[PDB]
Design an enzyme around this catalytic site. Structure first.
Site, mmCIF file in Angstrom:
data_model
loop_
_atom_site.group_PDB
_atom_site.id
_atom_site.type_symbol
_atom_site.label_atom_id
_atom_site.label_comp_id
_atom_site.label_asym_id
_atom_site.label_seq_id
_atom_site.Cartn_x
_atom_site.Cartn_y
_atom_site.Cartn_z
ATOM 1 N N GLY A 65 -40.266 -9.782 -61.247
ATOM 2 C CA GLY A 65 -40.651 -8.598 -62.006
ATOM 3 C C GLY A 65 -39.855 -7.336 -61.727
ATOM 4 C CE1 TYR A 113 -41.290 -3.945 -58.628
ATOM 5 C CE2 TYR A 113 -42.100 -5.857 -59.739
ATOM 6 C CZ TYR A 113 -41.516 -4.619 -59.765
ATOM 7 O OH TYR A 113 -41.072 -4.035 -60.915
ATOM 8 C CB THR A 114 -46.496 -3.023 -55.439
ATOM 9 O OG1 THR A 114 -46.606 -3.826 -56.593
ATOM 10 C CG2 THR A 114 -47.198 -1.694 -55.701
ATOM 11 C CG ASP A 169 -32.704 -8.207 -61.196
ATOM 12 O OD1 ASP A 169 -32.582 -7.851 -62.412
ATOM 13 O OD2 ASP A 169 -31.733 -8.647 -60.500
ATOM 14 C CE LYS A 170 -40.930 -7.481 -66.121
ATOM 15 N NZ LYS A 170 -41.671 -8.780 -66.297
ATOM 16 N NE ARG A 200 -50.773 -1.456 -71.567
ATOM 17 C CZ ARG A 200 -51.610 -0.505 -71.159
ATOM 18 N NH1 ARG A 200 -52.422 -0.667 -70.108
ATOM 19 N NH2 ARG A 200 -51.607 0.663 -71.817
ATOM 20 C CB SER A 254 -57.965 -20.426 -65.989
ATOM 21 O OG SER A 254 -57.844 -20.001 -67.340
ATOM 22 C CB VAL A 287 -50.162 -22.313 -63.234
ATOM 23 C CG1 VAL A 287 -51.542 -22.885 -63.484
ATOM 24 C CG2 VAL A 287 -49.063 -23.333 -63.525
HETATM 25 C C1 LIG Z 1 -44.551 1.614 -61.114
HETATM 26 C C2 LIG Z 1 -43.089 1.795 -61.528
HETATM 27 N N1 LIG Z 1 -42.228 1.048 -60.568
HETATM 28 C C3 LIG Z 1 -42.286 -0.467 -60.674
HETATM 29 C C4 LIG Z 1 -43.073 -1.129 -59.544
HETATM 30 O O1 LIG Z 1 -42.464 -0.968 -58.263
HETATM 31 C C5 LIG Z 1 -41.380 1.689 -59.735
HETATM 32 O O2 LIG Z 1 -41.335 2.907 -59.726
HETATM 33 N N2 LIG Z 1 -40.613 0.974 -58.868
HETATM 34 C C6 LIG Z 1 -39.605 1.357 -57.999
HETATM 35 C C7 LIG Z 1 -38.978 2.585 -58.026
HETATM 36 C C8 LIG Z 1 -37.916 2.864 -57.185
HETATM 37 O O3 LIG Z 1 -37.326 4.091 -57.181
HETATM 38 C C9 LIG Z 1 -37.363 4.996 -58.281
HETATM 39 C C10 LIG Z 1 -38.369 6.118 -58.017
HETATM 40 C C11 LIG Z 1 -35.956 5.524 -58.445
HETATM 41 F F1 LIG Z 1 -35.145 4.445 -58.744
HETATM 42 F F2 LIG Z 1 -35.973 6.341 -59.538
HETATM 43 F F3 LIG Z 1 -35.516 6.146 -57.286
HETATM 44 C C12 LIG Z 1 -37.419 1.832 -56.318
HETATM 45 C C13 LIG Z 1 -36.254 2.006 -55.457
HETATM 46 O O4 LIG Z 1 -35.971 1.155 -54.637
HETATM 47 N N3 LIG Z 1 -35.416 3.058 -55.666
HETATM 48 C C14 LIG Z 1 -34.207 3.253 -55.016
HETATM 49 C C15 LIG Z 1 -33.192 2.313 -55.265
HETATM 50 F F4 LIG Z 1 -33.460 1.228 -56.030
HETATM 51 C C16 LIG Z 1 -31.958 2.504 -54.683
HETATM 52 C C17 LIG Z 1 -31.726 3.635 -53.903
HETATM 53 C C18 LIG Z 1 -32.698 4.578 -53.683
HETATM 54 C C19 LIG Z 1 -33.925 4.379 -54.260
HETATM 55 CL CL1 LIG Z 1 -35.128 5.525 -53.995
HETATM 56 C C20 LIG Z 1 -38.022 0.558 -56.359
HETATM 57 C C21 LIG Z 1 -39.091 0.331 -57.186
HETATM 58 F F5 LIG Z 1 -39.691 -0.884 -57.227
HETATM 59 C C1 LIG Z 2 -44.065 -4.063 -62.641
HETATM 60 C C2 LIG Z 2 -44.333 -5.484 -62.253
HETATM 61 C C3 LIG Z 2 -43.763 -6.529 -62.988
HETATM 62 C C4 LIG Z 2 -43.993 -7.855 -62.637
HETATM 63 N N1 LIG Z 2 -43.433 -8.855 -63.332
HETATM 64 C C5 LIG Z 2 -43.568 -10.162 -62.964
HETATM 65 C C6 LIG Z 2 -42.917 -11.296 -63.685
HETATM 66 O O1 LIG Z 2 -42.175 -11.061 -64.665
HETATM 67 N N2 LIG Z 2 -43.184 -12.547 -63.293
HETATM 68 C C7 LIG Z 2 -43.957 -12.835 -62.220
HETATM 69 O O2 LIG Z 2 -44.184 -13.997 -61.839
HETATM 70 N N3 LIG Z 2 -44.552 -11.874 -61.499
HETATM 71 C C8 LIG Z 2 -44.420 -10.555 -61.825
HETATM 72 N N4 LIG Z 2 -45.028 -9.523 -61.066
HETATM 73 C C9 LIG Z 2 -45.851 -9.900 -59.938
HETATM 74 C C10 LIG Z 2 -45.085 -9.807 -58.652
HETATM 75 O O3 LIG Z 2 -44.085 -10.838 -58.660
HETATM 76 C C11 LIG Z 2 -46.037 -10.034 -57.483
HETATM 77 O O4 LIG Z 2 -46.564 -11.366 -57.603
HETATM 78 C C12 LIG Z 2 -47.234 -9.060 -57.424
HETATM 79 O O5 LIG Z 2 -46.836 -7.752 -57.797
HETATM 80 C C13 LIG Z 2 -47.847 -9.021 -56.036
HETATM 81 O O6 LIG Z 2 -46.919 -8.518 -55.112
HETATM 82 P P1 LIG Z 2 -46.798 -6.926 -54.716
HETATM 83 O O7 LIG Z 2 -48.225 -6.547 -54.392
HETATM 84 O O8 LIG Z 2 -45.982 -6.937 -53.481
HETATM 85 O O9 LIG Z 2 -46.113 -6.242 -55.881
HETATM 86 C C14 LIG Z 2 -44.812 -8.170 -61.428
HETATM 87 C C15 LIG Z 2 -45.351 -7.111 -60.728
HETATM 88 C C16 LIG Z 2 -45.182 -5.798 -61.105
HETATM 89 C C17 LIG Z 2 -45.802 -4.769 -60.219
HETATM 90 O O1 LIG Z 3 -44.288 -9.100 -67.559
HETATM 91 C C1 LIG Z 3 -45.446 -8.932 -67.126
HETATM 92 O O2 LIG Z 3 -46.298 -8.268 -67.778
HETATM 93 C C2 LIG Z 3 -45.958 -9.571 -65.885
HETATM 94 C C3 LIG Z 3 -45.756 -10.925 -65.650
HETATM 95 C C4 LIG Z 3 -46.349 -11.520 -64.512
HETATM 96 O O3 LIG Z 3 -46.163 -12.726 -64.214
HETATM 97 N N1 LIG Z 3 -47.103 -10.735 -63.715
HETATM 98 C C5 LIG Z 3 -47.324 -9.418 -64.016
HETATM 99 O O4 LIG Z 3 -48.031 -8.719 -63.272
HETATM 100 N N2 LIG Z 3 -46.761 -8.852 -65.081
#
Ligand SMILES: CCN(CCO)C(=O)Nc1cc(O[C@@H](C)C(F)(F)F)c(C(=O)Nc2c(F)cccc2Cl)cc1F
Ligand SMILES: Cc1cc2nc3c(=O)[nH]c(=O)nc-3n(C[C@H](O)[C@H](O)[C@H](O)COP(=O)(O)O)c2cc1C
Ligand SMILES: O=C(O)c1cc(=O)[nH]c(=O)[nH]1
EC number: 1.3.5.2
Length: 355
Positions: free
Chosen positions: A65, A316-317, A67-68, A114, A183, A181
């Protein structure tokens, strides 16, 4: 804790998240990572894990999620992940849901998304991986594998055929494939689907033949988990990814955006994931490798998943709030905890709670 960890968590990420909408922030993150624009932790031997037909130099992967579309793989290794999972990739391109579709819950260290499987599609991703295929072959050999999470198009009549398409197109470029997967005539439907995916996998030439893993949500019933465990063993599925995001809303969420539709990730998912890992490890008798995911933002979080039965973990989060330095932090804390608990390496700790 390093200077960078603190600056990013305390100042930079809050500032950036206040200046940018969430989808833009994620987009920017992909573009900076893809360009190698990253803060500068040497991986000890104790972090090495051997599973899934592969060396993993460390057990902390980037979850699907982020790097989609497979645009930032190399930068994700530079960030210090032991393995990268791209996708979900659908067969045809598709836009995913309308915006807004991703939300920050900073008070809960959580995200709701979503996205709806927005994807460049197999063909774009195939050409993108092909361009760096030999670079990846060296990375894999060096202990830095690649996973590909395979999705299905929104209006697909035949889910199995979409995943089969993905196996054929990206399987030859992946160390492992993942099929999500939901349910489960439900157990038989799952069997039929996973049979077809495995048959397609098995039809690839030996050197280009990936492991197949099933990724589950945390919202399955007892019956669903029992059935998934049974099918996974029966068919020789290589592993499980435990878990995806949750459709639940745990009591206690504070963020204003808590009632947005979507999957919830981050800290409120953490323990629900861990307990999923625990149940899946027991239901598979510790014989099916598990990648543990959900609310990992520390060494302790990582170690709790390992000890519950994960061979590997993803996060990820946590990046949303800690930025790139979280990767080094988790690794450093995990190593220190492994030493404090008497484990020679990660491998010794896998499933240690069950013994
Ligand atoms: C909820 C929105 N979501 C997706 C879920 O996570 C998000 O905000 N994600 C999210 C943002 C990030 O940074 C935003 C603020 C950026 F890009 F604008 F700075 C980075 C992140 O690692 N950044 C980063 C980088 F790649 C390289 C060098 C410095 C920095 Cl700081 C990772 C993330 F997953
Ligand atoms: C923005 C976002 C996009 C996601 N997209 C996918 C996806 O395309 N396919 C997938 O299997 N999981 C997806 N996930 C779920 C993550 O792979 C992971 O299972 C879930 O976020 C729990 O880990 P975290 O709490 O460390 O983010 C996504 C999560 C987030 C937050
Ligand atoms: O692309 C999404 O909405 C997505 C897919 C997935 O497997 N998990 C998730 O939280 N979001």
């Amino acid at each position: 804790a390093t200077g960078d960890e603190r600056f990013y968590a305390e100042h930079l990420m809050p500032t950036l998240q206040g200046l940018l909408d969430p989808e833009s922030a994620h987009r920017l993150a992909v573009r900076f990572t893809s360009l190698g624009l990253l803060p500068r932790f040497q991986d000890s031997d104790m972090l090495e894990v051997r599973v899934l037909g592969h060396k993993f130099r460390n057990p902390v992967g980037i979850a699907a999620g982020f790097d989609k579309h497979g645009e930032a793989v190399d930068g994700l290794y530079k960030m210090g992940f032991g393995f990268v999972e791209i996708g979900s990739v659908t067969p045809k391109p598709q836009e995913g849901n309308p915006r807004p579709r991703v939300f920050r819950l900073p008070e809960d260290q959580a995200v709701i998304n979503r996205y709806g499987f927005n994807s460049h599609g197999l063909s774009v991703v195939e050409h993108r991986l092909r361009a760096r295929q030999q670079k990846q072959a060296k990375l894999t050999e060096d202990g830095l594998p690649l996973g590909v999470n395979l999705g299905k198009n929104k209006t697909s009549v035949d889910a199995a055929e979409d995943y089969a398409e993905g196996v054929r197109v990206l399987g030859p470029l992946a160390d492992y494939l993942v099929v999500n997967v939901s349910s489960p005539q439900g157990k038989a439907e799952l069997r039929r689907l996973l049979t077809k995916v495995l048959q397609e996998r098995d039809g690839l030439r030996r050197v280009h033949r990936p492991a197949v893993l099933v990724k589950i949500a945390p919202d399955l019933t007892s019956q669903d988990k029992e059935d998934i465990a049974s099918v996974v063993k029966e068919l020789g599925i290589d592993g499980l990814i435990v878990t995806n995001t949750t459709v639940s809303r745990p009591a206690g969420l504070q963020g204003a955006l808590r009632s947005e539709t979507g999957g919830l990730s981050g800290k409120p998912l953490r323990d629900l994931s861990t307990q999923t890992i625990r149940e899946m490890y027991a239901l598979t008798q510790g014989r099916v490798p598990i990648i543990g995911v959900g609310g990992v933002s520390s060494g302790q979080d990582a170690l709790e998943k390992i000890r519950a039965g994960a061979s590997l973990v993803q996060l990820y989060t946590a990046l949303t709030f800690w930025g790139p330095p979280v990767v080094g932090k988790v690794k450093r804390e995990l190593e220190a905890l492994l030493k404090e608990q008497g484990f020679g390496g990660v491998t010794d700790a896998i499933g240690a709670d069950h013994r």
